[PDB]
Amino acid sequence: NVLKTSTLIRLVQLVVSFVSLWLTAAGFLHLLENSGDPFFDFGNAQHLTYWECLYFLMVTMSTVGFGDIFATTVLGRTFVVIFIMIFIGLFASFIPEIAEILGKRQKYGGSYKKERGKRHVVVCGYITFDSVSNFLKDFLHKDREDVDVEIVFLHKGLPGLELEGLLKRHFTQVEYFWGSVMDANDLERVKIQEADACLVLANKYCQDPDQED
Amino acid sequence: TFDDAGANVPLITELANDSNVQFLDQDDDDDPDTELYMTQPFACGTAFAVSVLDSLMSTSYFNDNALTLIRTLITGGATPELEQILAEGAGMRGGYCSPAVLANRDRCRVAQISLFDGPLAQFGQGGHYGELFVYALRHFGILCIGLYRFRDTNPSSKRYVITNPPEDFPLLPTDQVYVLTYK
Ligand SMILES: [Ca+2]
Ligand SMILES: [Mg+2]
C-alpha cells in the first residue's frame, strides 16, 4: 500500500507503461532487423544492437527522425509504420502530463528559521502585490524608528510575478510561505507562538464584506 | 459571565464539517490528521457530526435487531406503529389512553447517577467498577454501561466517557455512571 496519493499513482503508471512499451518495441525491432525478412530467405538483414534500436525508436517517437539509423527489412519498415501511428500519440501525451505532474510541487514550502534576537510578525488574509506593497512601504518606511522586525507572509496562493519580485527586493527581512492560518501545522511552520503579533488584512473591494469579515 | 458561569454551561454542538471540531475548544492540542472520534470535544460529548453514524449501514446489514435496540433507546420508543401513523399524514394522533397500552410506560431508560452521595458512594470512595456493577444490579436492577470522569483530576469541568471499564477499574468519588434503569 505504498502509492497513497492519486497524482503519485498516475506518475508511476505513466512512467512504467511508457518505459516498458519503449523497451519492448526496441526488442521487437531488434529481432526483426537482425533476423531479416523471411520471404527473402533471411538474406535482407541489418545488424543493429539493441541500444541502436532503443535510440532509433526514441528519435522516431519524438518525430525528430535523424535517419542516421533506419529500418531496412520489410518487417522492420512495416513495424516502424505501425509504431509511428501508435507511439507519436503516446510520446506527445506523456511528455505534457509528466511536465504537469512535476510542475505541481509547491515552491514556497518549508518553515521560518527563527533567529537568536529578531522579533517577527506574521501577516495573512488578503495577500496580493497591491496589499503587500502598500503594507511594506509603510511598515518598513525610512521615517520609522530603526527596528529589525521580520515580516512573515502566510497565504494559500502562489505569489504572482510582481509579488515574487517584491519579495526578492526585501529578501533580508520579508519571508513568504504557502499555507493557511486555518491549519495548526502552518501556524507552527511560521512559529506563531514566538511572533510579536499576527496581522490579518482584508479585501476592501470584495463582492460581500460580511462574507469577508 | 453571570451575576449570582461561562465554561460551566453544558453544550453540545452539531458540526456540518468534522475538521472544524478543532476550533470548538481550547486547552486541546489540535491536530488535523486525527479523526473526529479521538478529538477532545467528541470524547467529552460536546461535539457531534453525521460521519460517526455511517457504520449504521453495515450494522443494519449484520444484525437488524441491534439497530432496533439503539432506536428504542435514542428515539425514546418510536415503534413502527408510530411511524405508520405519521405516514398517514394526519399528524401524531393522541388522547387519554387505555391501561392496556399505558402499561408501556415502564420502558427502560438511559440515566446517569453520581458516586458523590447516596448508597453507591461507598464505591466512589476508592472501590472498583466491578464491585459497583454487581452491587447496583443486584440491589436496584441498575445495569451500568460506563463512566463519565473528570479529565482534570488534580481545574476545568470537562469530563470524558469510558464505555464498559474493566472489572478492576478504580473509581473516583466525582465519577458519574451511565446506567440502564426502570425508575
Ligand atoms: Ca482546539
Ligand atoms: Mg530572517
A4: chain B residues, CB-CB within 8 Å: none
- Whether residue A45 contacts residue A35, with contact meaning beta carbons closer than 8 Å, is answered with yes
> Experimentally, how was this structure solved?
cryo-EM
What's the gap in Å between A56 CA and the centre of ligand 2? 52
Residues annotated within the binding site of A for Mg(2+) are 115, 150, 175
Q: What ranges in B1-77 are assigned the alpha helix state H?
A: 40-43, 56-62, 64-74
B32: chain A residues, CB-CB within 8 Å: 183-185
CB–CB of A185 and B32 under 8 A? yes
Q: How many Å apart are CA A16 and CA B117, to the nearest integer?
A: 71
A185: chain B residues, CB-CB within 8 Å: 32
Q: Tell me the ligand closest to B42's alpha carbon.
A: 1
B30: chain A residues, CB-CB within 8 Å: 184
Q: How many Å apart are CA B33 and CA B39, to the nearest integer?
A: 10
Top residue of A185, A188, A193 to mutate, by most chain B CBs within 10 Å, is A185
Nearest one of A169, A177, A165, A171 to A124, comparing CA atoms: A177
B31: chain A residues, CB-CB within 8 Å: 184
Give the closest-approach CA distance of B70 to chain A in angstroms: 36
Chain-centroid distance of CA B183 in Å reads 17
Nearest one of A189, A195, A200, A197 to A118, comparing CA atoms: A195
Q: How far apart are the first and last CA of chain B?
A: 37
Q: Tell me the ligand closest to A184's alpha carbon.
A: 1
Sign of CA dihedral B78, B83, B84, B90: positive
The resolution, in angstroms to one decimal, equals 2.9
What's the gap in Å between B99 CA and the centre of ligand 2? 81
Range A121-143 burial, b when 16+ CB lie within 10 A, else e: ebbbebbbbebbeebbeebeeee
Sequence-separated (6 or more) residues with CB below 8 Å from residue B151:
B40, B44, B158, B159, B160
Residues annotated within the binding site of A for Ca(2+) are 143
Closest-CA residue of A relative to B28 is A184
Give the closest-approach CA distance of A189 to chain B in angstroms: 14
Q: What ranges in B4-161 are assigned the alpha helix state H?
A: 40-43, 56-62, 64-74, 80-87, 99-102, 121-124, 129-140
- Whether residue A56 contacts residue A29, with contact meaning beta carbons closer than 8 Å, is answered with yes
Give the closest-approach CA distance of B32 to chain A in angstroms: 7
**Per CB distance under 8 Å, which residues of A are interface residues toward B?**
183-185
Range A96-120 burial, b when 16+ CB lie within 10 A, else e: eeeeeeeeeeeebeeebeeeeeeeb
Top residue of B21, B30, B39 to mutate, by most chain A CBs within 10 Å, is B30
Give the closest-approach CA distance of B157 to chain A in angstroms: 25
What's the gap in Å between A187 CA and the centre of ligand 1? 13
What is the longest distance spanned by two Cα atoms in chain A? 93
Q: How many Å apart are CA B78 and CA A142, to the nearest integer?
A: 74
Residues annotated within the binding site of B for Ca(2+) are 22, 25, 28, 30
Q: Tell me the ligand closest to B39's alpha carbon.
A: 1
Q: Which amino acid is at B136?
A: A
Q: How many Å apart are CA B10 and CA B46, to the nearest integer?
A: 8
For chains A and B, count residue pairs whose Cβ atoms are closer than 8 Å. Answer: 6
Q: How many Å apart are CA A91 and CA A95, to the nearest integer?
A: 6
